Design a protein around this ligand. Structure first.
Ligand SMILES: O=C(O)c1ccccc1O
Ligand SMILES: O=C(O)c1ccccc1O
Lengths: 675, 675
């Protein structure tokens, strides 16, 4: 009881207004501040070039102790991881794996020259490949064959060319759309991707990938399904055809699957901190191809194989621009999904070590990479989560690991040629399924969100459900919209409390919470921690009339009944209630004024102003004063703009704090009946 | 300087926590409070019957001085207004006007028995009629004729029966949907219809009605258009065919139009306060039919006529229930639009005089009326704004005016028969166009909303644009969604301010606003009036780092540069910055602590907790204390649920008010370097 001495006069609001003054701080040349730009300043031009060419700024910094070794090992690991699942992703899109090698090689080099994040991997990804394959299958069916060809029993060449052309058109459209969005400053919209939303979306994507690749794991041909309820159709189709499966492919697939799982757990347990982690996937693919070649499994048991792999490089070609009037919506979906995934991964990795990534620059770089890849026979690309985690978890410090991976894939595509020819698809399926474990383990957020807050749990569950059973684009859009309406719900159900004063102090807290706070006699205090706008205006009035226990309509009805039963034989804002006042007053409270807390109110609109005016008018008509405490500048401005401060007396109702309102009410009551 | 004496010790938060105690107030039998319901209490049963049968409660109150006269005149006016525009609305739906008379008669009686609002009119409405006509035309075209009929040159009878059957099926589906929504407590969702949204929607509807009825006014046959860009197609079609028009219909239409306009303005100016307003529309229709009969305009000039009107009553019939698998979406649209319009009108009229209307009860009553009307050959109904305003503006005090209108329309449909036979459609078009003036005048809200607040103006303009050029249902849904996203935008761009202390007091206000507030030496205060959640977490941190002028990264870089240049030859939360401290300190501020205002923050989530933890960690690493002032119970609970209060020292950072934080910082600084 030694500090916090105030001794200050009552500050209603006109008193504080006349106590203060005003400043101007008026800016000049409004709307023309940018007319001084585009000058010959060397610093500004240097900054612009640095912004649009990230490769220039992050390059002189080049140490040799551990940077080179870490970058080299990260490049080795990311290349040996990108090769087999790159082939698998190409194979998932009804396109030969050579285009997967092209997607692994071409755009990585360009993203090295254009890229803000320094720990992100670039490749074919999974969801993008699935959508490309679905579009190619739908637009070019497997039954329509032009008879003016080879006139053989079976021909699967013109169909492949048509699918490639469709994929190229879609990729070019996606790249153009991404570039246009990046230039137009549309990269700002990535803050709406909440963490549970991303977690649920990625878990649903992992489930989709697992279900899709199960059929290749078994080795049974099944027609491709795409659209609403795609996963359930695919799983019922594969379960219906479990019989007549291939035993050899299943056996080798489970063998490599178990080998990968055991090796990963052993490496996690083994003291490989000082050494470099071994390439499990590279060893797996080498062993698989060696066994298949040594046992001649293509004809001994009729197992599926990767097929012939042309050896060389192919000159650039101009893609068709006449199919755009059928593949415009799906291109938008691909661009949106890819941008969201890559920006989420980049932002998650950036906050970890030291820096922050730009949003629009990544979009522009991705669009440039997509367009130029489409120019060089390459389908759409995005950020792959597993490769990014591997690169970060190995020692990568820049995008030079991507360059090393590009050199590795160039060596593969110009040197081996025939080495990766006898490779069963079962090992690829096992590799992808094993890699899916990291995203499968993300189910642990259910109990944590159940314990912490049910809102995040609801967002997670809604995203997972809408992205699993329904489509992927529709799921993402609906999840974002629901992640937005969650805020409206949260502000539509606030916590109404009645305040009480701590003894001989100025602290007002919840009345039914601490057992030693008492109501000020004749005064009731109400608090709402939410803005008062159109969606929340009647609920506030109802809660005020109910929780405090003072209902003006009931008082008016009771008084009218009392008057009826007794008889047996330029602006005024406040009016007293005439009453005979002998014995008809009901036994209850004797509240004379109500104080409203407005410190927690952020904004108000016309509906809120109207409802406050109605509340004030009704309570003045009954005979109870109403005061507002703690109104901020924004709320005062909103009240002034609407026709509220006509000032018969309404300008004197405002107060700076709850204690000021209480003291003003007490002194006003003391001035009456005692003077 | 006489009042407001406090003299209270510093209340950080642990001090206040140990100063207080706790209560329980634990409820019992959670989730079983409703198991005591459905009892034999006479009061509860009486209240339930009153709730589900409004007609019982509001009936004994029956005075005779002015109630009877006002109700009678209101009924007269509403009936004479409902007849001609009822015929016009039936005619707009490609249905004979007899069904319009049925829609005027049948459901009004039932809404009298089921209805909360006591000043609302019931009838066919305009938008509903347009949608019914569009559906009937689309599903049953005007070119498909079954050859197995009369085999005449022209037959327009089976097509009419098909259109009637389609309308009946749609009406039955709408009634069923409305009843199901009303029972399921879905009537709560009407608070999202903001006033500018309703104004813009009604203005767009009025424009649609005017454009649609212009072609009937001219007298030129044109094919009906429905869908996206319907209004522009209709207007270009009617303007393309302005030639070969009918002069007689145009002449009579402008004659009656001018008569109505002049009569309405005269009545507004004339002292008809004591007398009863004359039925302008009834006189207009009487004069029109008299002139048409006396001049034989059907064959003298080939003008369009209402046609033959069968005289009698028709027995109930069971409608087809096999077309529901084509007319389910449009039924939903009709139900939603009708409910929204009627609830908006009822809520606007209810707040005026004395009472409030229920939401679910109106929905249930409307659904019952729609279904039973569909049983008795009646298309969909809703609330008509013009009739409601006329009934309110005449002296109506209950729904008995609807009963009088029902008796009037029964008299018309069983008595006249041949009287309203020679009636040109031009007079109906003029009557509807004249009635549209009230909704056309609603354009005056543009300057008011431009002056008051641009948010309401944006909502108004977006609703008008999306409901005029685009469809009506799509416009309404998109307008509701955009009105919802407005709140997200508003909370995404708050006002960041830096506070300053008034001399020798405890009032802290905007520093650059009043010219006599000074910064506390060595202390900076930041305030944000918005919740800190996922969509607004990085902007808050950036504003805090920029506006205050203390950037931790810049300080770290400068100190590292100084150290580099000088050399020429179980948990700890706060660490001091080691420095040689001779001449390398930059000339600037000397802030030692930062106080964050949290009175205006309503809620927080995981992202906000993470960003506050990051801010605190960074500023502690640099060497600046961070305090939080005014945190509420909800914010404290949100911080506790997430892993924030691990309590190395973080539990002592909280403070009850800004002045408490300032005093604590000052005493903490005084305790050092002086003791
Ligand atoms: O890399 C994959 O196979 C993958 C697929 C879907 C979701 C997350 C992923 O890492
Ligand atoms: O009654 C009408 O004709 C009308 C039509 C559209 C909008 C508002 C209206 O009052």
């Amino acid at each position: 009881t030694q500090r916090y001495y105030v001794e200050r006069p009552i500050f209603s609001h006109p008193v504080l207004q006349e106590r203060l003054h005003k400043k101007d701080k008026i800016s000049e040349s409004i709307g023309d501040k940018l007319k001084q730009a585009f000058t010959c300043t060397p610093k500004k031009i240097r900054n612009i070039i640095y912004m649009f060419l990230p490769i220039t700024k992050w390059l002189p910094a080049y140490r040799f102790k551990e940077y080179v070794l870490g970058d080299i090992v990260s490049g080795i690991s990311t290349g040996v991881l990108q090769l087999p699942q790159g082939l698998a992703f190409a194979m998932l899109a009804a396109v030969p794996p050579v285009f997967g090698l092209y997607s692994s090689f071409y755009p990585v080099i360009m993203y090295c020259f254009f890229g803000t994040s320094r720990h992100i991997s670039i490749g074919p990804f999974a969801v993008i490949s699935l959508m490309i394959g679905g579009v190619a299958v739908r637009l070019v069916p497997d039954d329509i064959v032009i008879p003016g060809g080879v006139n053989a029993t079976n021909s699967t060449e013109a169909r492949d060319a048509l699918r490639v052309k469709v994929a190229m058109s879609v990729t070019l459209l996606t790249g153009i759309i991404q570039f246009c969005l990046g230039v137009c400053r549309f990269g700002f919209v990535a803050i709406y991707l909440t963490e549970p939303l991303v977690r649920g979306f990625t878990t649903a994507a992992a489930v989709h990938v697992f279900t899709s690749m199960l059929k290749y794991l078994f080795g049974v041909k099944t027609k491709r399904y795409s659209g609403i309820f795609s996963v359930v159709y695919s799983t019922v189709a594969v379960l219906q055809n479990v019989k007549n499966l291939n035993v050899c492919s299943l056996g080798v697939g489970l063998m490599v699957f178990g080998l990968l799982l055991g090796g990963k757990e052993f490496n996690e347990r083994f003291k490989e901190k000082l050494p470099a982690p071994i390439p499990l996937e590279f060893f797996a693919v080498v062993m698989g191809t060696g066994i298949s070649a040594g046992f001649s499994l293509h004809e001994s048991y009729n197992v599926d194989v990767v097929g012939t792999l042309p050896l060389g490089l192919l000159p650039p070609a101009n893609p068709d621009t006449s199919l755009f009037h059928l593949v415009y919506v799906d291109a938008i979906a691909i661009a949106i999904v890819g941008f969201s995934v890559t920006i989420s991964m980049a932002k998650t990795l950036a906050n970890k070590h030291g820096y922050q990534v730009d949003g629009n620059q990544e979009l522009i770089a991705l669009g440039l990479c997509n367009s130029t890849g489409s120019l060089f026979q390459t389908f759409a690309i995005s950020c792959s989560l597993s490769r990014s985690l591997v690169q970060e978890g190995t020692g990568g410090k820049t995008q030079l690991a991507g360059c090393l991976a590009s050199l590795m894939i160039l060596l593969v595509i110009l040197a081996t040629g025939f080495l990766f020819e006898s490779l069963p698809q079962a090992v690829l399926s096992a590799i992808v399924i094993v890699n899916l474990k990291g995203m499968f383990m993300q189910f642990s957020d259910l109990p944590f969100f159940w314990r912490t807050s049910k809102i995040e749990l609801t967002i997670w569950l809604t995203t997972f459900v809408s992205s699993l059973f329904l489509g992927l684009d529709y799921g993402l859009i609906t999840a974002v919209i629901i992640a937005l309406m969650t805020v409206i719900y949260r502000t539509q159900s606030p916590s109404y409390i009645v305040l009480g004063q701590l003894p001989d102090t100025d602290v007002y807290i919840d009345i039914d919470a601490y057992e030693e706070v008492k109501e000020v006699p004749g005064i009731k205090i109400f608090q709402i921690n939410a803005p008062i706008y159109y969606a929340n205006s009647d609920l506030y009035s109802s809660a005020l009339k109910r929780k405090t226990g003072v209902n003006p309509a009931f008082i008016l009805g009771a008084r009218r009944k009392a008057m009826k039963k007794y008889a047996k034989e330029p602006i005024v804002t406040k009016s007293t209630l005439p009453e005979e006042l002998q014995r008809f007053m009901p036994p209850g409270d004797n509240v004379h004024t109500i104080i409203l807390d407005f410190t927690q109110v952020n904004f108000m609109d016309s509906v809120g102003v109207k409802t406050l005016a109605g509340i004030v008018k009704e309570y003045g008509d009954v005979g109870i004063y109403v005061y507002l405490a703690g109104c901020s500048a924004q709320v005062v401005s909103d009240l002034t703009q609407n026709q509220f401060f006509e000032n018969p007396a309404l300008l004197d109702l405002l107060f700076h704090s709850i204690h000021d309102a209480v003291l003003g009410s007490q002194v006003r009551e003391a001035l009456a009946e005692q003077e």
